[PDB]
């Protein structure tokens, strides 16, 4: 009753029937399900190690079947750069990742701004390039104490000349004389002929912009296929037939779970329906298929005799059978089952009158120790003519009558600025 005054924004209501809202059910508890695995990811072999590679010929390593707990780096590692694309840093502890990779190399100090999509320079043109739709993070830190010496270090090189530009995630490890003029080089260095590879000279007294740095790049995909690397979270049991929240390899939602009959292929983990929504899933600890269904559907209405007469009302449920009603806000033994729903708070009767409030499907209600009643609308009186083959009736008087009729003609005129 109080849900209609707010809807129409007033403290007074009049006779009629209103629609309000639908029927909703709320979840009871939560649930989480992750794959079970014990090994910890190789956080030592990757980040701090003996020797790194050169820019023009980098490295790539594959990671799988481990648990990612990056809090173990708080003790020693101190990073000066950290950026992530396509994800949020605060959400990294609840997801599971697929197809992870790591790259490593060493570059100069003021050339770390070119590791980003859409950039120009000598490092993003001939040595290392990144795609446009990237998904991962970039990390770097200063390593002046482990890669410099008196007299210089000449074990790090980079490419200086090329004919065209690289393409994303491409490599080039070829050495061949480069002809910069109209004279063919002929394989021997000379005028207008150069060696494409140069060297880095690192000394302990160089400026802050001429000191070594170390870089690592991480790449993965999210929420599209089976995963093998997961964060530091815990599992739970399986409650089936009731509205609950769930977490399936990072996916979140609510609904009801039940056993299905579909049969997934080996390389599939999720299902979809006509609209882009999820309705099937595979349990990662049992290898079974489950179904998901929403928890709310069904409408309601309110019947009132006007707020200036009384404070009683009746409620109509349009998708229930009063014989066994499982859904009802409060549910006085005045239950009557019509053909348009379920009625609570009204008294049935036998006689018929003229309709006052049209409920629907040939039923009506009116306020009449006053209470509310629900009768069946009547069509009219009944008559029968005397048809014989040799009889007739003729009038012998008349009458004069007057009646009225009303018709709208015009409207109101308006203007706007």
């Amino acid at each position: 009753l109080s849900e209609t005054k707010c809807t129409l924004k007033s403290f007074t209501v009049e006779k009629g029937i209103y629609q309000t809202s639908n029927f909703r059910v709320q979840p009871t508890e939560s649930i989480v399900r992750f794959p079970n695995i014990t090994n910890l990811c190789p956080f030592g072999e990757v980040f701090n190690a003996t020797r790194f590679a050169s820019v023009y010929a980098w490295n790539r390593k594959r990671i799988s079947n481990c648990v990612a707990d990056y809090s173990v780096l708080y003790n020693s590692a101190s990073f000066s750069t950290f950026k992530c694309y396509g994800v949020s840093p605060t959400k990294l502890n609840d997801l599971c990742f697929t197809n992870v990779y790591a790259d490593s190399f060493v570059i100069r100090g003021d050339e770390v701004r070119q590791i980003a999509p859409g950039q120009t320079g000598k490092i993003a043109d001939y040595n290392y390039k990144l795609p446009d739709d990237f998904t991962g993070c970039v990390i770097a830190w200063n390593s002046n104490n482990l890669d410099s010496k008196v007299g210089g270090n000449y074990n790090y090189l980079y490419r200086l000349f090329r004919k065209s530009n690289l393409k994303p995630f491409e490599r080039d490890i070829s050495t061949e004389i480069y002809q910069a003029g109209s004279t063919p080089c002929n394989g021997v260095e000379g005028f207008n002929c150069y060696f494409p590879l140069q060297s880095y000279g690192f000394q302990p007294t160089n400026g802050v912009g001429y000191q070594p740095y170390r870089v690592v790049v991480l790449s993965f995909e999210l929420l599209h296929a089976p995963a093998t690397v997961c964060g530091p979270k815990k599992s739970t049991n399986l409650v089936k037939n009731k509205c609950v929240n769930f977490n399936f390899n990072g996916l979140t939602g609510t609904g009801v779970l039940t056993e299905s009959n579909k049969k997934f292929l080996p390389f599939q983990q999720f299902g979809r329906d006509i609209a882009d929504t999820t309705d099937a899933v595979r349990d990662p600890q049992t290898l079974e298929i489950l179904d998901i269904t929403p928890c709310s559907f069904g409408g309601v209405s309110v019947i009132t005799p006007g707020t200036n007469t009384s404070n009683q009302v009746a409620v109509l449920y349009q998708d229930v059978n009063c014989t066994e009603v499982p859904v009802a806000i409060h549910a006085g033994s005045n239950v009557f089952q019509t053909r348009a729903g379920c009625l609570i708070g009204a008294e049935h009767v036998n006689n018929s009158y003229e309709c006052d409030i049209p409920i629907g499907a040939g039923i009506c209600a009116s306020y009449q120790s006053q209470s509310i009643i629900a009768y069946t609308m009547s069509l009219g009186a009944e008559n029968s003519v005397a048809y014989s083959n040799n009889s007739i009736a003729i009038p012998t008087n008349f009458t004069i009558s007057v009646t009225t009729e009303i018709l709208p003609v015009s409207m109101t005129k308006t203007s706007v600025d």
Binding site: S401, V402, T403, T404, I406
Partner: protein, 98 residues
């Protein structure tokens, strides 16, 4: 509180939002002004056949047999008064074709 370069971004949203509620009003007025025309055509047709003559069409200018009618004026509309003939006091007899 904001410089023009930042203010334009958030003023464009307001402009596009407020330009959308001025079109639903016009569309609804256009739709709803097409029924008063139908009503006014019926009134004009009814003022020429029941007031300036006698009608033989059943239930057009009242209930019964039409005799005459008179008009009147009301705010934003018109009112009609119809006069009709009604029998009464029937009786039974016997009948033959020839």
């Amino acid at each position: 509180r904001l410089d023009p370069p930042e203010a334009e971004v958030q003023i464009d949203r307001l402009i596009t939002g407020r330009l959308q509620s001025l079109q639903t009003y016009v569309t609804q007025q256009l739709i709803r002004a097409a029924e008063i025309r139908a009503s006014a055509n019926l009134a004009a047709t009814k003022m020429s056949e029941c007031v300036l003559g006698q009608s033989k069409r059943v239930d057009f200018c009242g209930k019964g047999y039409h005799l005459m009618s008179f008009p009147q004026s009301a705010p934003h509309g018109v009112v009609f008064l119809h006069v009709t003939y009604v029998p009464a006091q029937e009786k039974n007899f016997t009948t033959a074709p020839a």
